[PDB]
């Protein structure tokens, strides 16, 4: 009358037969999330195989299937990305809540389907009154994570979230979408952070708001760090790492929250050292040195190595317009420290590529006795997507982690470095940026 | 002599190019130059001794590099 | 998928869609009353709001276990679905065995009967070779290397002629 | 015996990755 | 298994043996080992050659995990296939395909003077049906201008050449205005992004057309190969395939000491294991450890 | 089931050379 594994075998035999249509797949997936069956990977594989095999599709079964895929936290890019054709065929016959669920669902998996996001953003900005603001935040999440830099829907969401007072989780999802988009509209972000006072039913959305405000660098809200402090048990290590990183980037001062987060994070690396990817380990080292909070002795040297690994791996896969910009800034450092001709320009630039204490390699490393000045070029991938174009919080993270190694990191962003006439003004700008960081040079 | 450079020279490019070029005259030989410009050289230089040519340009270096690596991967 | 997801107990499915399994949620503002009903065994629990948000904390991250690879298995599935198309037209072949009897032997011209027996032997050849499905794997291994060498491009694995022509349109119609 | 692993089974088999690695290991020192 | 520049490329990849070597290296670093210093040497030619031969080790085992959408009608299988090739290029350290082939054009013709020479140098990267349509426009404006059309940007021959190359590109189906508006940029984000949303509709049209052309050629090759194979008797097929298997296996047992040959023979043993574990439980699949 | 391992790159960008239709369906109908 209440039995979990026998109903798992009933769903298992219901999905293993040959002619399963889509409604049986959808409710098998929903019934597989509601029983929380992350322990069985083969059953989710059978359900996703039958979801890829189905050809009939209406609004309801597609919507509940996509809801179940994202609530259960399963990821298979093939069967989810092949569910977007059923979406674009059924898109005008979708309800606004159904379009919300499918666009958030296909955006969360990262489906690069530009026709779906264009024809969904056109729908949600053609009839904006139809959409309750949670539907707005879900479509914003999906269009942001699907790889379109859509600011039309971002401006429409800013108007809705400034006009309509919204939920805590709704505002958190909108903050996560705006953080991936890199937009930092204070008129929108303020209207979202004012919604974090009614008490939050989840901890993952407070952690996502902390990571979002860290990525945008507004400041720590103090109505988010306390909710994250009390409820640091609802987070995976890969989630508490993002939480602590976004707390340290926004400039939080509470150490009790960092104790509560690293008490989750550090025994996960004690049990399994390799289970967390090196982007999370680098974010952990950032959060461990910026706020100064302490974590065990193996984990400290581990993330100290892993920040260097992730740093020179991101250097190795450099975007090739960041690389020419780093060459331009290094030539400007050459003719700013005094190098009249091109042989000593090239000799200075090749001299500036000294290594790092963590094993990495730094592009423009100028040392004078004990005082060292590192120069950073922040091209456009680490800028805000607006016409002010303030650099994102990750370059402040990199600067503040290199600063604990002995450097006085000078930031040379490319929105203004490229707006200079020639090499003399660029050398003047680089020297002025160095002097207001370290005037001892 | 005659030197062809990609862009017009600096006065240290001229001096160390002059010091580079005395390895191709094996005596106490002075060089006068007739410096020309060819943008299809991508840096480096081409020395023309009117009986002898030294190609220290980098267009020659990248095409010889490409010949080397396109030959060596056929060897393995 | 992403590290933070925002679904669970809000605009969730209120009922199942097919009658093969019955599922109802009686959701209040705080928790949910779910009774999943599948045939002989039915189960029931009270799923929290902090459980459907805690479910995507770890990811399943499904991946296919293949005999050789997933590319090879896609090519072999295409070869099998083409051998089905040839088998379906060896399925509509007329029964020549209903004309083997000696009343058909002696009424017929000798060369036409020799042609008829050769046609029967020919069908047995075609049917014996279209059902050699243990050959499709080594047939799929002949499409793999040339395709996989076309995807080791010096530009991009996903580059093609339309994107390269559009980028030449941008490049040539810009200021040199 | 049987039931090998999960990550040992997800790897594609007859991709090269070790002729490319062999050509790198015989080419990059020979061109340095 | 790790050479400290291989493992930096394999961090961002999600392939199985790449993540296995990454996890083994990270697990050895957790037991107190030291990160080797990254080499600040191997100048631009060696750096680009090592990039070419390190990205290929992420590309080509990642190609074999992308199912070709053969015999699949619709937009979503081809969009899945091209999206997986996009994510594989991003994992391997490539840029967008547009940015990467435009970088190829800028690298090839950094040294050219006349526009017929940029057509002779980007011959390998543009379709010959487009290269011929540009060569005839170049000869058409070369008859009237009576000069080699130089690659300048403001010369009257170049302006009246580009005003016709835009016409032939509009004839081809390439909207040159939206592509130029995206790759040039605009000031107001609400009028730059409304043309980026048109560039991305063209771009999605472009890469699904290219992926569908690749799928159509693989479909045609597999159908041609099968219909050449279905005309043989069964004994010829069996002896031809057995001879090909035995020769390719003897080629791997000939060269020993190499890593690729022992990985090849390990993979043959793994296929034999797959057949054995399907043989012991055929209605459930291969035995996966759980 | 195994294929020859190749290590070579595609330096050109070419349309993928679609193959001509076989006559095997027409010959089997014949």
TrEMBL record, chain B:
List locations, semicolon-separated. Answer: Membrane
What domain of life does the native source organism fall in?
A: Eukaryota
The entry's family comment says: Belongs to the ATPase delta chain family.
Q: What is this protein called?
A: Mitochondrial ATP synthase subunit OSCP
Q: What is the lineage of its organism?
A: Eukaryota, Viridiplantae, Chlorophyta, core chlorophytes, Chlorophyceae
TrEMBL record, chain C:
Source organism superkingdom: Eukaryota
Query: What name does the UniProt record give this protein?
Result: Mitochondrial ATP synthase associated protein ASA7
Automatic annotation (TrEMBL), chain D:
Question: Where is this protein found?
Answer: Mitochondrion inner membrane
Q: Which domain of life is it from?
A: Eukaryota
Q: Which family does it belong to?
A: Belongs to the ATPase alpha/beta chains family.
Function of the protein: Mitochondrial membrane ATP synthase (F(1)F(0) ATP synthase or Complex V) produces ATP from ADP in the presence of a proton gradient across the membrane which is generated by electron transport complexes of the respiratory chain. F-type ATPases consist of two structural domains, F(1) - containing the extramembraneous catalytic core, and F(0) - containing the membrane proton channel, linked together by a central stalk and a peripheral stalk. During catalysis, ATP synthesis in the catalytic domain of F(1) is coupled via a rotary mechanism of the central stalk subunits to proton translocation.
Q: Can you say what this protein is called?
A: ATP synthase subunit alpha
Recorded name of the encoding gene: atp1
TrEMBL record, chain E:
Q: What highest taxon heads this organism's lineage?
A: Eukaryota
Q: What is this protein called?
A: Mitochondrial ATP synthase associated protein ASA4
* Taxonomic classification: Eukaryota, Viridiplantae, Chlorophyta, core chlorophytes, Chlorophyceae
Q: Supply the gene name.
A: asa4
